[PDB]
Structures are given as C-alpha cells and as structure tokens.
Design a protein around this motif. Structure first.
Motif, PDB file in Angstrom:
ATOM      1  N   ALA A 247       0.788  -1.223   0.000  1.00 31.81           N
ATOM      2  CA  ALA A 247       0.000   0.000   0.000  1.00 31.81           C
ATOM      3  C   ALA A 247       0.825   1.281   0.000  1.00 31.81           C
ATOM      4  O   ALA A 247       0.271   2.343  -0.304  1.00 31.81           O
ATOM      5  CB  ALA A 247      -0.961   0.023   1.200  1.00 31.81           C
ATOM      6  N   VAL A 353       5.448   4.202   7.276  1.00 26.74           N
ATOM      7  CA  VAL A 353       6.148   2.937   7.455  1.00 26.74           C
ATOM      8  C   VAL A 353       5.617   1.918   6.458  1.00 26.74           C
ATOM      9  O   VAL A 353       4.401   1.793   6.273  1.00 26.74           O
ATOM     10  CB  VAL A 353       6.000   2.410   8.898  1.00 26.74           C
ATOM     11  N   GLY A 354       6.525   1.186   5.835  1.00 23.50           N
ATOM     12  CA  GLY A 354       6.155   0.028   5.038  1.00 23.50           C
ATOM     13  C   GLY A 354       6.967  -1.179   5.449  1.00 23.50           C
ATOM     14  O   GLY A 354       8.162  -1.072   5.727  1.00 23.50           O
ATOM     15  N   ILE A 355       6.307  -2.332   5.475  1.00 16.30           N
ATOM     16  CA  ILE A 355       6.930  -3.589   5.872  1.00 16.30           C
ATOM     17  C   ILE A 355       6.684  -4.620   4.782  1.00 16.30           C
ATOM     18  O   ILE A 355       5.535  -4.864   4.402  1.00 16.30           O
ATOM     19  CB  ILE A 355       6.387  -4.118   7.214  1.00 16.30           C
ATOM     20  N   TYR A 357       7.460  -8.671   4.090  1.00 15.14           N
ATOM     21  CA  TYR A 357       7.754  -9.785   4.984  1.00 15.14           C
ATOM     22  C   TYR A 357       8.954 -10.590   4.499  1.00 15.14           C
ATOM     23  O   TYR A 357       9.638 -11.228   5.309  1.00 15.14           O
ATOM     24  CB  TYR A 357       6.522 -10.683   5.099  1.00 15.14           C
TER      25      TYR A 357
ATOM     26  N   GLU C   5      -3.998   4.497   8.741  1.00 21.61           N
ATOM     27  CA  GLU C   5      -3.815   3.971   7.386  1.00 21.61           C
ATOM     28  C   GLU C   5      -3.182   2.577   7.414  1.00 21.61           C
ATOM     29  O   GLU C   5      -2.341   2.227   6.583  1.00 21.61           O
ATOM     30  CB  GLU C   5      -2.997   4.964   6.548  1.00 21.61           C
ATOM     31  N   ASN C   7      -2.825  -0.861   6.410  1.00 19.82           N
ATOM     32  CA  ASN C   7      -3.216  -1.735   5.311  1.00 19.82           C
ATOM     33  C   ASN C   7      -2.373  -3.000   5.374  1.00 19.82           C
ATOM     34  O   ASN C   7      -1.149  -2.922   5.510  1.00 19.82           O
ATOM     35  CB  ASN C   7      -3.035  -1.043   3.957  1.00 19.82           C
ATOM     36  N   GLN C  13       2.704  -5.221   5.327  1.00 19.37           N
ATOM     37  CA  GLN C  13       1.717  -4.221   5.710  1.00 19.37           C
ATOM     38  C   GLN C  13       2.396  -2.863   5.815  1.00 19.37           C
ATOM     39  O   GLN C  13       3.625  -2.755   5.829  1.00 19.37           O
ATOM     40  CB  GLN C  13       1.012  -4.595   7.021  1.00 19.37           C
ATOM     41  N   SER C  14       1.570  -1.819   5.874  1.00 13.85           N
ATOM     42  CA  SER C  14       2.072  -0.456   5.947  1.00 13.85           C
ATOM     43  C   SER C  14       1.085   0.404   6.723  1.00 13.85           C
ATOM     44  O   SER C  14      -0.095   0.067   6.861  1.00 13.85           O
ATOM     45  CB  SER C  14       2.324   0.125   4.549  1.00 13.85           C
ATOM     46  N   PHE C  15       1.589   1.521   7.233  1.00 15.60           N
ATOM     47  CA  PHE C  15       0.821   2.404   8.104  1.00 15.60           C
ATOM     48  C   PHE C  15       1.593   3.711   8.241  1.00 15.60           C
ATOM     49  O   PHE C  15       2.718   3.846   7.750  1.00 15.60           O
ATOM     50  CB  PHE C  15       0.572   1.758   9.470  1.00 15.60           C
TER      51      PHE C  15
END
Ligand SMILES: C=C(CC(=O)OC)C(=O)N[C@@H](c1ccccc1)[C@@H](O)C(=O)O[C@H]1C[C@@]2(O)[C@@H](OC(=O)c3ccccc3)[C@@H]3[C@]4(OC(C)=O)CO[C@@H]4C[C@H](O)[C@@]3(C)C(=O)[C@H](O)C(=C1C)C2(C)C
Ligand SMILES: Nc1nc2c(ncn2[C@@H]2O[C@H](COP(=O)(O)OP(=O)(O)OP(=O)(O)O)[C@@H](O)[C@H]2O)c(=O)[nH]1
Ligand SMILES: Nc1ncnc2c1ncn2[C@@H]1O[C@H](COP(=O)(O)OP(=O)(O)CP(=O)(O)O)[C@@H](O)[C@H]1O
Ligand SMILES: Nc1nc2c(ncn2[C@@H]2O[C@H](COP(=O)(O)OP(=O)(O)O)[C@@H](O)[C@H]2O)c(=O)[nH]1
Ligand SMILES: [Ca+2]
Ligand SMILES: [Mg+2]
Ligand SMILES: [Mg+2]
Ligand SMILES: [Mg+2]
Lengths: 441, 426, 54, 319
Positions: A247, A353-355, A357, C5, C7, C13-15
């Motif tokens: 996202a 922030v993006g993660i 995996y 936010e 998601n 995932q992100s926020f």
C-alpha cells in the motif's frame, strides 16, 4: 498495474543496473534464462512484478530496461554476463568513443548524434506498456556520459513523456574511487540542467559506500563490484514497493507526494541497516529497535552529513523481513526521546512505514550476510545540502582560475553555462538554508 | 577498439621507438616474428591499441618509421625486433637533414612528408575507432625536430579531432651533437605548444645524470639513455595497454592532466633506479618516495622550484592497494605546499597487476609541474646567446628561412615561460 | 502517537505514525541550443583550418 | 608530521596553541584554505563544518562543537533551560529569565507584577540596562532579541571594599566528550563599593587588574566565612557545568561522526550572600587570564590535540 522503465546511462549506471537486475531476478525467482516457475500466467499478466518485467510467449521475463553508454566495453559485459539471456539486443545501446569525462562532449557533441536512437528504443518499450507511469534513471554525476547525456535525455523525456514521473539514482563523486579531476564541473552542470526534469533523486555518495564496505564488510580496498552490490540492496529496498504487493509507495507519483513537498528540494537521504559481513559465522541479529536506531547514525547514510543540524520534511521507513508494526512504534518512541529529530513547522512530525515480509535477498558468494530484518529510511532533510556545499566549493576553486574550461568550450559549450549552472546551485543552497535554519570573552 | 597510430622520426626517434616496441612486445607476449606466446589473457585484452592483427593470428605494430636518411632505419630493420614492423611502413629519404630544422620542416622534409601521410592514412583507415597518434622524436636535430613537427601539423589538418601525443627528447649541451640544437629545439617547442595535446619532456641532461649518479655508469652511451626512456615509455602507456579505470585513453588522460591548453608538457619519472642490491625486494613506501624524488625525474627540473598542477602515478606489480593509497596520500599531505590548492584532488593513482619483465614492483610518475619552465628557460638562454650574434644562422637562411621567424620563436617560448610563472604564483 | 492507514496483505503491511501535527523547454528550444553549440564547434574548426592553411 | 590551519587570527588562546604546536617539531602550519589538514582552528562565525571529514586518509579535528551556540547565546540558553527536561523551568541555579522580541513578554509581566504586588529588579542584555520597574525595561529593547533576567540583589561582597564580583571557569570538552575543568579560575572583581558591572573591560586597588585567583579567594573564604572554595562554591560550579554540557551532548557529540570536535568554554558564575552559585552565561570563544595562558594552552595541546595526534599531574579536573 502500471509499468516502470529503467534507463542506465554510462559506466556507473550500467554496472549498477546489472547488479540491480541480478538482485531483482533472485528476489522474484527468475532464472538467468528468464524463466520464472512461479508465474503461472504464461505469456502475460498484471502482477506487481510485471511493473519491471514484460513476458514473452515462451515464458521469458524481460526487464523493462534500456542500457546506454558511449563506448562498448561496459555494456559488452552485459551481453556476455550471467544474465545475458535476459535482454534482447535492442535494449543495449553503445557508441564507439565516450565523452572523455566531459559534460559538454556527452551533452552536445556526442549526445546530439545518439539521442534519437535512444528515444526510439525507449519508445519501443513504452509501446509495450498499457499504463506507463515513468522512468528510473541510473547514472553518475562525474562521468561525461552519466552527466552530459543524462541531462539531455531527461530534457527530451519531459518533452516526449510530459505526464510521466522521472526518478534518479545518482552517483555523487568521491576522490577515493574517482576517475576525473573535473567531476565537480560535470556534477554541477548536470544538476542544473536536470533539476526541473527530475521529480525525486536518490544521491549515493561513493565515499559513504566505500567507508561502509571498509567498516562493516571488512573490505580493505572495495571495488566497484563491492560497491554496486551494496548500492543494489539499497535500490532494491527503495523500488520493492513497486515490484511487490503493498500500500505504500506503489506508484512513482507517491514518491514525490510522500517525500518531496517542494519541487526543487527533491533529494531524499537514504540510510540503510544492517550491513553485516558474510565471512563471520555468527552475527547477533539486530532487533527492530536496533536497526531503526541505526537509521539515525551518520555512518549508515548514503551521504555523510549531520541531520541533527538540519530539519526534516518527510520520513519513510521501509522494512524487509521479520518486522511487526508494534515493534516499529516502540522503537520510534524510544528514539524520539533520545535523538535530535526536528521537523519544519509546516510539516507533520511523523513516519510513513512500510513492511515487506520477505527478508532482503543477498547474492550467493557476495559480501553481505543474510539478515533476519533490514530497513531503509528515506528522509528529506536539509542536511543533505552539505553535499551541495562541498561540491560547489570544489567548483569555485577551479572555475576562479578557469581550469579545464577550454575542454568544455572546445565542444561547443559557452562559459556562461558554467556561471548559470553555479548560480542555480547557489540558489539551491539558499533554498535549503531558508527551509532548515532557525570573541575574546 | 581505440587504436593508436605510432610514428618515430629521425635518428633519436627511431632508436628510442625501436626500444619501446621491443619492451612492450615482451610485455604482451609478442616474439620478434609477431607471434603471441604469452600465458595471460590480460596481454591480449587491449593489444589492439598498438598492434594490428594480420593473417595467421600475427600481431603487427601500428608503427610508422620516418627518416631523411636510411642509416638508422637500416639498423632498426637489422635489429632484434626489426622483422616485426610492416615493411611498407618504412618511409625514408637519402639526403639527410644535417641537424637542420629548416631542412626537416621546409625543404628536405617537405619532399617526403606526403609519403608518410599516405602510410598514416592507410593505418588510420584500418582503425575501428582511432583515438590519436603518438610521436617519438628529438627536438635538437633536423628530421625528428623539423620534419616531426611538420608531420604533426599536417596530421592535425587531416585529423583535427584526434589526440596528438609526443615523447620529445630535449637537447642539453652536456649530451650534445651540434651547437645548433637550441635553435632546432626553440623552433620545435612552438610547434608543440600549438599542435600537441600531451608532450612528455625527456631531457638528455637528466637521463645522463641518472645513468651517471644513480646507476653508477661512468661512461653512459645513447643506448643507456634509451634504456631509461623505453622503460619510462612502457610505464606511461600502461594505462592505455592494459585494462584499467584511470586515464584509459589519450583523451581522458588529457582532460585529467591539462587544465590550460598550452601547458601540456609533462615531467616523467620511473622507479626503481639503482646500481647493480638488484635482487633486493622493493616496498611500497620505497617506490613512492623514489618516484617523487627529483633524482628519478627525466626533465632536469626541480619540482620544489614550482608547483604541481596535476599528477598521474601508475604502480605495476602485485602489492597492497591499501598500502599504495596510504603512501600516496602520505606524500601528498606531507608536501601539500607543492600542489596547487585550486585544483582539488589533482593526484590520481592507477595500479596494473602485470609488472615489467625483470621487476616485481615498479612505479611511473607523470607530473604537470610549473617547474618545467626551467627547461624552457635553459633553451631560451642558449638560443639567445647565439642569436644575439646571429651565429650559425646561415645554415637556416640558406634553406629560405628569415631572421624574423627566429625572433618570433624566441618570443613564443618566452611567453610560454611567463605563462608557467603566472600559475606558479597563483 | 497514533497509527493511521493500516493496510495489510499477505506479503506485508504499511501504516503511518504521527507524533505531532505541524503549526519546460520545447523540442525546438532544445534543438536550437544543440545546433548553436554545433555551429560554435564548426566555427572553431574553420578557424583552425584557416590557421593551418596560412 | 601533523598539519594544521589557522582561521581566527584574533584568538589569543589559539594564537598561543599554534605557536606551541610550532615548537614540537611535529606540527606544520598550512595556508588557511588548504583542505589537507589534521587540525582546524576555525573561525568563530560560519565555520564550514560540512566540509570537514571528507579528505581521504586524514583524521580531521576542529576546535569547535557544531551546535554549541545554543549554550553560548543568551536567548537560546534561556530557551534551552526552559525547554530541556534535563534542566527544567524549575532549574534552581539559573536566574528567572524570559525571551522577548522587540514571545514571552506577557509571562514576564505576570511574574513581575506578582512580586511587586508582594524586590524585583531585572536586567537587559543580548548594551546593558538595569531597572526596577518593567515599563522602562521594555522601551530600551525597541531601540534585536533580548532577554530580561532577575538581577541578583544580594551578591556576595568581598571585604575590604564591599565589592561585587563574578567567577570565570574554563572548561575543555575533548573529542570523547570528557569534561575537563581547569583547576585555575579567575574572579573579575569590581573595584567600587556596591560597581554593578564586573566586566574586566570596565582599577587595581585590592588586586592587580581587578583579578583575584583561587588561592587568594579560598584563603579569604576561610578567614572571613570559615569555609573553603571547594565546598561553598566549586561543588555547585561543577554541578552546573556537567548539567549544561550533558544536556546538549546528544545534539553536538561527534563520537560517531566523520570528523571530531573539541571546544574551550567560558562559564560565568555569580555568588549570592548565602553562598549559592548562579550561572550567568556560557562563552564559546573565551579569552584567558594573562598568567594562566601558558598553562591552559599547554593543557589544550596535551588533552585535546595530542590525544588524537600523539607526539613522539593534570591541570584539569575531570567531570
Ligand atoms: C626489455 C628491457 C631491456 C633489457 O634490459 O633487456 C636487455 C627492459 O629493460 N625491461 C624492463 C622494463 C622496465 C620498466 C618498464 C618496462 C620494462 C624490466 O623488466 C627489466 O628487465 O629491467 C632490468 C634492467 C637492468 O638492466 C637494470 O638497469 C640498468 O642497468 C639500466 C641501465 C641504463 C638504463 C636503464 C637501466 C635495472 C634497473 O632498471 C630497470 C628498468 O629496472 C636500473 O635500476 C633498475 C633496478 C633493477 O633491479 C636493475 C638495477 C637490475 O639490476 C635488474 O637485474 C635488471 C632489470 C630488472 C637489469 C640489470 C637487467
Ligand atoms: N558506485 C559506482 N560508481 C562508479 C562506477 N563506475 C563509475 N563510477 C563513478 O562514476 C564516475 C565516473 O563516471 P563514469 O560512469 O565511469 O563515466 P561515464 O558515465 O561512462 O562517462 P564517460 O566515460 O566520460 O563517457 C566516478 O566518480 C566513478 O567513481 C560503478 O560501477 N559503481
Ligand atoms: N542576573 C544578574 N544579576 C546580577 N548581576 C548580573 C546579572 N546578569 C549580569 N550581571 C552582571 O553583568 C556582568 C556580565 O554581564 P554579561 O556576562 O551578560 O556581559 P558579557 O557577556 O558582555 C561579559 P563576558 O563576555 O565576560 O561574560 C557581570 O559582572 C554580572 O555582575
Ligand atoms: N636519448 C637519446 N638522444 C639522442 C639519440 N640520438 C640522438 N639524440 C639526441 O638528439 C639530438 C640530435 O637529433 P637526431 O635525432 O640525431 O637528429 P635527426 O635524425 O635529424 O632527427 C641531440 O640532442 C642528441 O643528443 C638517442 O639514441 N637517444
Ligand atoms: Ca504474469
Ligand atoms: Mg565511460
Ligand atoms: Mg559574553
Ligand atoms: Mg644524429
């Protein structure tokens, strides 16, 4: 899905692009012959990895990439390398004589004769896109081709692809591995001409990469191969959001929206951790807090500078591996109490922030150890202006004596372009100062 | 494929040129018959720069041999590697030049120059992407000096966008054949100021002093001097002949070394140089210190009497690259007074893994120093001592030259000296 | 401190976490520049060939 | 051999340090704009910190901490103390101050009126004016940002003379952020009976040059007050020095930086009649007492310079 076309200009751009696409293939499970046993939609598809790879009817996954250099020996290694089967000849463009570390030779004399061919080949890739979003341009500041031809290409891309976004990965010159005395000239000339045509540029100072390789990988004298494998890990972290489901930063326009509040101040600082040597049999695995704390260490930045003495305008944290949001927030809260993190008053004080995996992939036989979690921080801080001040000062020392200027005038350039470019850099330094700055006793 | 066309003119030019081709043929594994017999692919990777590949996987030097008398080129053809040169590339007359610049430049040389240009054109037409020319000659005689500079001017006319590089032997009264050498050298230097991109200034006074004082050669011959030159020429062309990142072609070398177009006269140096101890291993600190010592430089100018605009250093052999950097930055930081402050990072270092035949480690120095004005000052003084009394001018006016051409050449070299002094004080 | 936010997908995932609120040249123009530099190169070469003719 | 450059010709402290380096036989002075130096004795204003630590193969050290100005400018020092939780607005050793621009103008009045309702003499500086009522203090500042500070109405007065004074302490912070207090301080004493300003610029009656050193001052405290300089005063001085410098350490430390910093500071203290020590200001480019030049400058070379660049009883107290 919206496609992204990568353009690699000059030796630095080509060799870094070679490293990146090798890493992309390993990350996506693409073999050197272009086959990808996980892509069950044979001959097509609109998956996230299709932003960087087209597909043939025989199942080959072909990079959306063009390589251009004014001499053939660097691109010839792409033609004969491990991933030679990945590319068709039309993606590899070479001349016979290079720009001789001369911006004027790359932009005017030689660039005028090859720009139309480069655009024709790019147009062939663009015609294969159903919704092209823009270009990623890899080049050095210091080379004659990386500086001179890139700026010409960026101008024409703005004309031909007016609505497309353009991002740069730019190699800032360092004397420890530099090949030309005139690299400060080429850097200022290309930054002036390219400034209005680039929406976001990630500068990588060769000095920072060199020192990280020496300190963290115990490499006494790093080579371009050592440097490029590290650089490609940072590039992969930055572009991963375009190639995998997610996202955050899912289109090129999001890079500008998230990282660049003013058009001219579009040079985010990248910081990456952890960088750990393969040779050691057991490293202690750094937690989310430790790798996040490391993002505020100047020794891990892609450009050495002191963000404590600047102001932030935007900050993104891009994690890969075993990371959950709860630990990111706990790490950020601890860091904010103990670190000098000041934003401009007209911007929110927060992190996007993006993660992902999947842990960062490493090349087999490489120098980087396989880690359980890694992070690349992209911050737009006024502190990166220190890099402009360093470059502009070296420019001023030589230009006050007109040293080497005759080489540029000899290729059709005018002395006025030097001062016009330098004045633009002076205004850029002034812009950073405005945004970020508050005897015998 | 970036080919270089080599030209050697006159006695000194052909003798030093022959030794240069002997040396680099051994380095690239080429035998006197033109067959490759080395054991490393690095020997062939950039062999195209100096050699053409003929039928049967044979390698022929891209070299043209020029003289106004047949003597020296007869001895080259009957020499060790004499059979490796293309027989059609021997271009010679019979009258000689009589140590007379006017004969080489205006009369005897003008009769022969078109035939040399025919062979230059033939070699250039067979080049995938010609980068430029290198000329070996002396400035003190007639053919190399007078006809050599005539050739440079005509080549520039036909190939104006190619690089012109010379190895130019400067005369000295200590190693002198004739008294008119300052005349020939002063006329030639003006040609080089206009028509070359890079000129290695090889002073016969320095070569003799190195042979006598350092090599302990009580009676140096021209062969001893030419042995130093061929080793130096191999060193300064290493970056052109083997894979490398720095100064890999003539134009990138010129852009790095020449900040102002007329100041393109380099002082070369070589290390090690020692008396025959000879099997003793050399270390990186010892190579670096020797390579920067005036006693190892071949232009008989004291670099502490001027300042370095740019420096290129080439290390050859297996050694610690980290250690090379430390000693190179050591000598740079410890003697920062002798490097101009307004050209940042003006010392560039390259390393080539393949060392010369008899050494495990060597270093070659290329300096663009304002102290080279001392060389041009010496020539100007010797020029004026004779020209004030119009001595020996009849040799030149008899060939059609006027005294005004000597006056103009004198003014041009004094202008060059003044230009160096401008930047030495800067 | 606030998380917005969020998601989530199978690959990550992100926020966003907020700690404190606040308080081009045309083708012909390019062509003229490239041709103007080319003419200056031709003029400099013409002067050289005139100098060599003299 | 080590190389250094000089960028502040007006510094008496570092004009001395430079000649001591030019007496060891192992230091060479370069032209001021030569970038290939080990040590920069930099200019006081606009020192180009962003160009340090980018010379390959050179360990570079500079005699100023980037960001230490927050402590050494009067307005920013007030803001630092009131906004740093390590110091708090409840700080007991710093006089009540307010930053007002010609803003804390309204909060100053609420505090001023509440004690005039219930002595309230204040002082202005950034050019000094001491007034008893607030309306006069504000009109002088509109004639640059100033601060209004509570004036110490009950100072410790030396006898004989009934005279005001202040204490100057020299503090050296090295590249490892060790805090060194020079064992020798100076009392800049007024020579007039309480005369409100004790600056040495503003004679010679009781001590030479209106300077009393610690040996005599400690002897006085024993004779007149039955205490010592260490107990009654120096403990608070060391506490204040540590509090200020530890507060800014995360902001200015060069521990993991590509270049290194040290800096000499001048702390100015006042003592009230209850033997309580108050911080007045911190000076980032201080001079020294004429006698203490040789010892302190040698200590700078030993502690701050030779520690990083080794040559071929300590005068400092390590805090
Ligand atoms: C092909 C030849 C000619 C030749 O010689 O073949 C007949 C050649 O020269 N190649 C060489 C080369 C070097 C650099 C770049 C490219 C090539 C090299 O690979 C080699 O062979 O050097 C030769 C050169 C020597 O003569 C000798 O020098 C001289 O007396 C001398 C006399 C007059 C002028 C110049 C030298 C030589 C020196 O000079 C050198 C060059 O090293 C001098 O100080 C250097 C240190 C050497 O230790 C010392 C002392 C030697 O004692 C050594 O035992 C030896 C070697 C290693 C020789 C005795 C045979
Ligand atoms: N990190 C990294 N830097 C490189 C690499 N190759 C060259 N550089 C840097 O790029 C600068 C030189 O520019 P190049 O890219 O080699 O030159 P070019 O773009 O091919 O232009 P010309 O050769 O002059 O036609 C120097 O500062 C080098 O240190 C590389 O592979 N990796
Ligand atoms: N709040 C206060 N109460 C009492 N006296 C004060 C005071 N603030 C300042 N002073 C007096 O002012 C004098 C020094 O003022 P200040 O230090 O602000 O000026 P300055 O900085 O130009 C001199 P220096 O540079 O040597 O510190 C001291 O002698 C002190 O007695
Ligand atoms: N180093 C060196 N110098 C030479 C040699 N032969 C001649 N010279 C020098 O060259 C000058 C004479 O020029 P020369 O080449 O013989 O005349 P040319 O045949 O007319 O070009 C004098 O300064 C000589 O000292 C040689 O073999 N080696
Ligand atoms: Ca698919
Ligand atoms: Mg290139
Ligand atoms: Mg003060
Ligand atoms: Mg002769």
């Amino acid at each position: 899905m919206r496609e992204c076309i990568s353009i690699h200009v000059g030796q630095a751009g080509v060799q870094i692009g070679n490293a990146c696409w090798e890493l992309y293939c390993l990350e996506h499970g693409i073999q050197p012959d272009g086959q990808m046993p996980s892509d069950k939609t044979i001959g097509g598809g609109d998956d996230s990895f299709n932003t960087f790879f087209s597909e043939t009817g025989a199942g080959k996954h072909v990079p959306r990439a063009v390589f251009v250099d004014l001499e053939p020996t660097v691109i010839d290694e792409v033609r004969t390398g491990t991933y030679r089967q990945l590319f068709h000849p039309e993606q590899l463009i070479t001349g016979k004589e290079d720009a001789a570390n001369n911006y004027a030779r790359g932009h005017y004399t030689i660039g005028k004769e090859i720009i139309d061919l480069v655009l024709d080949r790019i147009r062939k890739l663009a015609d294969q896109c159903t919704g092209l979003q823009g270009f990623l341009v890899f080049h050095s500041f210091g080379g004659g081709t990386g500086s001179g031809f890139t700026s010409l290409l960026m101008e024409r891309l703005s004309v031909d692809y007016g609505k497309k976004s353009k991002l740069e990965f730019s190699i800032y010159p360092a004397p420890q591995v530099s090949t030309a005395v005139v690299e400060p000239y080429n850097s200022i000339l290309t930054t002036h001409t390219t400034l209005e045509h680039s929406d976001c540029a990630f500068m990588v100072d060769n000095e920072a990469i060199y020192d990280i390789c020496r300190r963290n990988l115990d490499i006494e004298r790093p080579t371009y191969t050592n440097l490029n494998r590290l650089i490609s890990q940072i590039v992969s972290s930055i572009t991963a959001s375009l190639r995998f489901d997610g996202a955050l930063n899912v289109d090129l326009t999001e890079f500008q929206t998230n990282l660049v509040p003013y058009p001219r101040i579009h040079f985010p600082l990248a910081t990456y951790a952890p960088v750990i040597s393969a040779e050691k049999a057991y490293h202690e695995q750094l937690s989310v807090a430790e790798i996040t704390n490391a993002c505020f260490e100047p020794a891990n930045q892609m450009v050495k500078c002191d963000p404590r003495h600047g102001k932030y305008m935007a900050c993104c944290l891009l994690y890969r591996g075993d990371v959950v949001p709860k630990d990111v927030n706990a790490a950020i809260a601890t860091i904010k109490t103990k670190r000098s993190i000041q934003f401009v008053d007209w911007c929110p004080t927060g992190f996007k922030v993006g993660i992902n995996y999947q842990p960062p992939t490493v090349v087999p036989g490489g120098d980087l150890a396989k880690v359980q979690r890694a992070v690349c921080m992209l911050s737009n801080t006024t502190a990166i202006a220190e890099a402009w001040a360093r470059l502009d000062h070296k420019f001023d020392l030589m230009y006050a004596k007109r040293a080497f200027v005759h080489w540029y005038v000899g290729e059709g350039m005018e002395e006025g372009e030097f001062s016009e470019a330098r004045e633009d850099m002076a205004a850029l330094e002034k812009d950073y100062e405005e945004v970020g700055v508050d005897g015998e006793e | 494929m970036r080919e270089i066309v080599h030209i050697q003119a006159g006695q000194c030019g052909n003798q030093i040129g022959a030794k240069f081709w002997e040396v680099i043929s051994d380095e690239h594994g080429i035998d006197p018959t033109g067959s490759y017999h080395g054991d490393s692919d690095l020997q062939l990777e950039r062999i195209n720069v100096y050699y053409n590949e003929a039928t049967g996987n044979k390698y022929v030097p891209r070299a043209i041999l020029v003289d106004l008398e047949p003597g020296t080129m007869d001895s080259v053809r009957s020499g060790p590697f004499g059979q490796i040169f293309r027989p059609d590339n021997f271009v010679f007359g019979q009258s000689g030049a009589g140590n007379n610049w006017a004969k080489g430049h205006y009369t005897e040389g003008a009769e022969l120059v078109d035939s040399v240009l025919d062979v230059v054109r033939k070699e250039s037409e067979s080049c995938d992407c010609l980068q430029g020319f290198q000329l070996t000659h002396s400035l003190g005689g007639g053919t190399g000096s007078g006809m050599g500079t005539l050739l440079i001017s005509k080549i520039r006319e036909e190939y104006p966008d190619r690089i012109m590089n010379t190895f130019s032997v400067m005369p000295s009264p200590k190693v002198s054949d004739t008294v008119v050498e300052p005349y020939n050298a002063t006329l030639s230097v003006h040609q080089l100021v206009e028509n070359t991109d890079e000129t290695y200034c090889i002073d016969n006074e320095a070569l003799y002093d190195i042979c006598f004082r350092t090599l302990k050669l009580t009676t140096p011959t021209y062969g001893d001097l030419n042995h130093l030159v061929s080793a130096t020429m191999s060193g300064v062309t290493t970056c052109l002949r083997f894979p490398g990142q720095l100064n890999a072609d003539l134009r990138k070398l010129a852009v790095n070394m020449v900040p102002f177009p007329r100041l393109h006269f380099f002082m070369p140096g070589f290390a090690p140089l020692t008396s025959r101890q000879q099997y003793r291993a050399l270390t990186v600190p010892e190579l670096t210190q020797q390579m920067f010592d005036s006693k190892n430089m071949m232009a008989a100018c004291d670099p502490r009497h001027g300042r370095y605009l740019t420096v290129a250093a080439i290390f050859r052999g297996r050694m610690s690259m980290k250690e090379v950097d430390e000693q190179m930055l050591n000598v740079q930081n410890k003697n920062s007074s002798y490097f101009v402050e307004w050209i940042p990072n003006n010392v560039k270092t390259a390393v080539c893994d393949i060392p010369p035949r008899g050494l495990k480690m060597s270093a070659t120095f290329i300096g663009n120093s304002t102290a080279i004005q001392e060389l041009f000052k010496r020539i100007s003084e010797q020029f004026t001592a004779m020209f004030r009394r119009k001595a020996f001018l009849h040799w030149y006016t008899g060939e059609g030259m006027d005294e005004m051409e000597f006056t103009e050449a004198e003014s041009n070299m004094n202008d060059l000296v003044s230009e160096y002094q401008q930047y030495q004080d800067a | 401190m606030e998380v917005i936010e969020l998601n989530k997908c199978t690959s990550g995932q992100s926020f966003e976490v907020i700690l404190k609120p606040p308080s081009d040249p045309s083708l012909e123009e390019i062509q003229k520049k490239l041709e103007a530099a080319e003419e200056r190169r031709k003029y400099q070469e013409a002067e050289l060939l005139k100098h060599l003719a003299e | 051999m080590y190389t250094f450059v000089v960028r502040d010709e007006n510094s008496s402290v570092y004009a001395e340090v430079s000649r001591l380096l030019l007496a060891t036989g192992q230091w060479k002075r370069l032209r001021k704009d030569n970038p290939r130096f080990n040590l920069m004795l930099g200019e006081r204003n606009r020192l180009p910190f962003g160009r340090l630590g980018h010379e390959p193969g050179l360990v570079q050290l500079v005699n100023y901490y980037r960001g230490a100005d927050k402590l050494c400018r009067k307005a920013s020092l007030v803001k630092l103390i009131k906004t740093s939780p390590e110091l708090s607005e409840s700080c007991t050793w710093f006089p009540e101050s307010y930053v007002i621009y010609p803003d804390e103008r309204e909060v100053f009045l609420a505090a001023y009126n509440r004690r005039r309702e219930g002595g309230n003499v204040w002082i202005a500086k950034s050019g000094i004016l001491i007034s008893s009522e607030a309306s006069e203090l504000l009109d002088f500042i509109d004639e640059q940002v100033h601060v209004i500070q509570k004036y110490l109405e009950k100072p410790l007065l030396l006898e004989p003379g009934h005279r005001k004074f202040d204490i100057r302490s020299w503090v050296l912070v090295d590249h490892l952020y060790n805090i060194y207090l020079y064992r020798e301080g100076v009392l800049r004493t007024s020579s007039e009976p309480y005369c409100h300003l004790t600056n040495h610029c503003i004679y010679g009656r009781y001590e030479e040059g209106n300077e009393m050193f610690f040996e005599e001052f400690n002897q006085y405290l024993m004779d007149a007050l039955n205490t010592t300089l260490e107990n009654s005063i120096l403990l608070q001085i060391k506490h204040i020095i540590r509090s200020c410098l530890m507060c800014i350490e995360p902001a200015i430390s060069t521990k993991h930086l590509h270049y290194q910093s040290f800096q000499l500071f001048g702390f100015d203290f006042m003592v009230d009649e209850e033997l309580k020590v108050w911080l007045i200001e911190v000076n980032g480019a201080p001079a020294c007492a004429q006698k203490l030049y040789a010892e302190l400058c040698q200590g700078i070379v030993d502690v701050a310079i030779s520690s990083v660049f080794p040559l071929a009883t300590s005068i400092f107290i390590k805090l």
